[PDB]
Structure formats: C-alpha cells, structure tokens
Amino acid sequence: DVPVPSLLRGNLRTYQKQGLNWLASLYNNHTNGILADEMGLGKTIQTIS
Amino acid sequence: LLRRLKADVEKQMPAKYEHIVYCKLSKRQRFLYDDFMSRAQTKATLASG
Numbered sequence: 576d577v578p579v580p581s582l583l584r585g586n587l588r589t590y591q592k593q594g595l596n597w598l599a600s601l602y603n604n605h606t607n608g609i610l611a612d613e614m615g616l617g618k619t620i621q622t623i624s
Numbered sequence: 625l626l627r628r629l630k631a632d633v634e635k636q637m638p639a640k641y642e643h644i645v646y647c648k649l650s651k652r653q654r655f656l657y658d659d660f661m662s663r664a665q666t667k668a669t670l671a672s673g
C-alpha cells in the first residue's frame with residue numbers, strides 16, 4: 576500500500592486505510608471482489624478514496 | 625471476499641442492548657384472534673395446501 580493522498584479532503588481512520596490497502600490489489604491485478612464490511616464503518620469512504 | 629467487523633474498532637463504540645418488551649393482547653384482539661382461529665379452522669387452517 577503506497578497511496579498518493581491528494582484530493583482526499585476529509586480524514587479517514589486506520590482500518591479504512593487498510594480498506595484502501597486491500598482495495599489496491601483489485602485494480603492493479605485486474606481482479607474483482609466483494610467488499611462486505613460491517614455497517615457503520617465507512618465503505619463509501621473507501622470507494623471515494 | 626473482504627470482511628471486517630466492529631471488534632477491531634472496539635472499546636470506542638458504545639454498548640448494544642437487546643431488550644424484549646412483553647405486552648398482553650387486548651380483549652377485542654383476543655376475541656378477534658379466537659374468531660380467526662375458529663374461522664380458519666372452518667377452512668382447515670390452510671396449512672398443508
């Protein structure tokens with residue numbers, strides 16, 4: 576996980592940054608998976624990020 | 625698959641209690657309930673249909 580953090584105005588927590596970490600292996604490896612996190616943990620922050 | 629839960633972000637989330645409130649049935653609801661049980665028994669309750 577080596578993210579370029581520009582245009583991300585708000586603040587995210589550590590586990591959502593780990594959500595971007597596990598989301599980094601999808602587009603770079605051309606793989607598609609289902610992200611099913613617990614409700615209230617900010618999946619939309621991971622998608623927007 | 626990608627799945628996390630609230631136990632990793634625990635000790636900052638508040639407690640969650642599940643209460644069960646019992647309320648007795650009303651008099652007209654008991655008469656109408658027994659009336660629908662008897663009238664359903666006239667139709668043989670439609671259980672195995």
Ligand SMILES: Nc1ncnc2c1ncn2[C@@H]1O[C@H](COP(=O)(O)OP(=O)(O)O)[C@@H](O)[C@H]1O
Binds near residue numbers: 614
């Ligand atoms: N870094 C953060 N700081 C504060 N609140 C946040 C943060 N990330 C997410 N949230 C809150 O978590 C909620 C996430 O809701 P949303 O992503 O729409 O649905 P869900 O997370 O239930 O799939 C948002 O309403 C937001 O207020």
Ligand code: BEF
Binds near residue numbers: 612
């Ligand atoms: F999973 Be969240 F409640 F949209």
